[PDB]
Coordinates of N, CA and C in Angstrom, one line a residue:
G1 N 0.8 -1.2 0.0 CA 0.0 0.0 0.0 C 0.8 1.3 0.0
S2 N 0.3 2.4 0.5 CA 1.0 3.6 0.6 C 1.9 3.7 1.8
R3 N 3.2 3.2 1.6 CA 4.1 3.2 2.6 C 5.2 4.4 2.4
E4 N 6.2 4.3 3.2 CA 7.3 5.3 3.1 C 8.5 4.9 2.3
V5 N 9.3 5.8 1.8 CA 10.5 5.5 1.0 C 10.1 4.5 -0.1
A6 N 11.2 4.0 -0.8 CA 11.0 3.0 -1.8 C 11.7 1.7 -1.6
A7 N 11.1 0.6 -2.0 CA 11.6 -0.7 -1.8 C 11.6 -1.6 -3.0
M8 N 12.4 -2.6 -3.1 CA 12.3 -3.5 -4.2 C 11.3 -4.6 -4.1
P9 N 10.7 -5.1 -5.1 CA 9.7 -6.1 -5.1 C 10.1 -7.3 -4.2
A10 N 11.3 -7.9 -4.5 CA 11.8 -9.0 -3.7 C 12.0 -8.6 -2.3
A11 N 12.4 -7.4 -2.1 CA 12.7 -6.8 -0.7 C 11.4 -6.9 0.1
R12 N 10.4 -6.3 -0.4 CA 9.1 -6.2 0.3 C 8.6 -7.6 0.7
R13 N 9.0 -8.6 -0.2 CA 8.6 -10.0 0.0 C 9.3 -10.5 1.3
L14 N 10.6 -10.4 1.3 CA 11.4 -10.8 2.5 C 11.0 -10.1 3.7
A15 N 10.5 -8.9 3.6 CA 10.0 -8.1 4.7 C 8.7 -8.6 5.3
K16 N 7.9 -9.1 4.4 CA 6.6 -9.7 4.8 C 6.8 -11.1 5.4
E17 N 7.8 -11.7 4.9 CA 8.1 -13.1 5.3 C 8.9 -13.1 6.6
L18 N 10.0 -12.3 6.6 CA 10.8 -12.2 7.8 C 10.3 -11.1 8.8
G19 N 9.3 -10.3 8.4 CA 8.7 -9.3 9.3 C 9.7 -8.1 9.4
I20 N 10.4 -7.8 8.3 CA 11.3 -6.7 8.3 C 10.7 -5.4 7.9
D21 N 11.1 -4.3 8.5 CA 10.5 -3.0 8.2 C 11.4 -2.3 7.2
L22 N 11.0 -2.4 5.9 CA 11.8 -1.8 4.8 C 11.9 -0.3 5.0
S23 N 11.0 0.3 5.8 CA 11.0 1.7 6.1 C 12.2 2.2 6.8
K24 N 12.9 1.2 7.4 CA 14.1 1.5 8.2 C 15.4 0.9 7.5
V25 N 15.2 0.4 6.3 CA 16.3 -0.2 5.6 C 17.0 0.9 4.7
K26 N 18.3 0.7 4.6 CA 19.1 1.6 3.8 C 18.8 1.5 2.3
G27 N 18.2 2.6 1.8 CA 17.9 2.6 0.4 C 19.1 2.8 -0.5
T28 N 19.3 1.9 -1.4 CA 20.5 2.0 -2.3 C 20.1 1.6 -3.7
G29 N 18.9 1.8 -4.1 CA 18.4 1.5 -5.4 C 17.8 2.7 -6.1
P30 N 17.1 2.4 -7.2 CA 16.5 3.5 -8.1 C 16.0 4.7 -7.3
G31 N 16.8 5.7 -7.3 CA 16.5 7.0 -6.6 C 16.8 6.9 -5.1
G32 N 17.0 5.7 -4.6 CA 17.3 5.5 -3.2 C 16.3 4.6 -2.6
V33 N 16.1 3.5 -3.3 CA 15.2 2.5 -2.8 C 15.9 1.3 -2.2
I34 N 15.3 0.7 -1.2 CA 15.9 -0.5 -0.5 C 15.8 -1.7 -1.4
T35 N 16.9 -2.3 -1.5 CA 17.0 -3.5 -2.3 C 17.0 -4.8 -1.5
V36 N 16.9 -6.0 -2.1 CA 16.9 -7.2 -1.3 C 18.2 -7.4 -0.6
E37 N 19.3 -6.8 -1.1 CA 20.6 -6.8 -0.5 C 20.5 -6.1 0.9
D38 N 19.8 -5.0 0.9 CA 19.6 -4.2 2.1 C 18.7 -4.9 3.1
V39 N 17.6 -5.5 2.6 CA 16.7 -6.2 3.4 C 17.4 -7.4 4.0
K40 N 18.0 -8.2 3.2 CA 18.7 -9.4 3.7 C 19.8 -9.0 4.6
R41 N 20.4 -7.9 4.4 CA 21.5 -7.4 5.2 C 21.0 -6.9 6.6
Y42 N 20.0 -6.1 6.5 CA 19.4 -5.5 7.8 C 18.7 -6.6 8.6
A43 N 17.9 -7.4 7.9 CA 17.2 -8.5 8.6 C 18.2 -9.5 9.3
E44 N 19.3 -9.8 8.6 CA 20.3 -10.7 9.2 C 21.1 -10.0 10.3
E45 N 21.2 -8.6 10.2 CA 21.9 -7.9 11.2 C 21.0 -7.6 12.4
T46 N 19.7 -7.6 12.2 CA 18.7 -7.4 13.2 C 18.4 -8.7 13.9
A47 N 18.3 -9.7 13.2 CA 17.9 -11.0 13.7 C 18.2 -12.2 12.7
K48 N 19.4 -12.8 12.8 CA 19.7 -13.8 11.8 C 19.8 -15.2 12.6
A49 N 20.4 -15.1 13.8 CA 20.5 -16.3 14.6 C 20.7 -16.0 16.1
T50 N 19.6 -15.6 16.7 CA 19.6 -15.2 18.1 C 19.3 -16.4 19.0
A51 N 19.9 -17.5 18.7 CA 19.7 -18.7 19.5 C 20.6 -19.9 19.1
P52 N 20.4 -20.3 17.8 CA 21.2 -21.4 17.2 C 22.7 -21.0 17.0
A53 N 23.6 -21.6 17.9 CA 25.0 -21.2 17.8 C 25.7 -22.2 16.8
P54 N 25.5 -23.5 17.0 CA 26.2 -24.5 16.1 C 25.8 -24.3 14.6
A55 N 26.9 -24.0 13.9 CA 26.7 -23.8 12.4 C 27.8 -24.5 11.6
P56 N 27.5 -25.8 11.2 CA 28.5 -26.5 10.5 C 28.6 -26.0 9.0
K57 N 29.6 -26.6 8.3 CA 29.8 -26.2 6.9 C 29.8 -27.4 6.0
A58 N 30.8 -28.3 6.2 CA 30.9 -29.5 5.4 C 29.8 -30.5 5.7
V59 N 29.2 -31.1 4.7 CA 28.2 -32.1 4.9 C 28.7 -33.5 4.9
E60 N 29.0 -34.0 6.1 CA 29.6 -35.4 6.2 C 28.8 -36.2 7.2
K61 N 28.7 -35.7 8.4 CA 27.9 -36.4 9.5 C 26.4 -36.3 9.2
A62 N 25.7 -37.2 9.8 CA 24.2 -37.3 9.6 C 23.5 -37.0 11.0

C-alpha cells in the first residue's frame, strides 16, 4: 500500500516473510530504494541467529 520510502519487489517480500521493516532499511536502489541486499543485510543484522550457535559447513555427518 501507501508506505514510506521506496523498496524492491523481492525486498518487500522478504520483509513480509521475515517481518522486516523496509521503512528502516538503507535505500541504495532506483533513486534511493531499499533492495533485497539491504533487506537481507538488515534482517540478518537485526535477527539472523539469536539462539542457534552450532553452524556446520561441510556435509559429512548425519
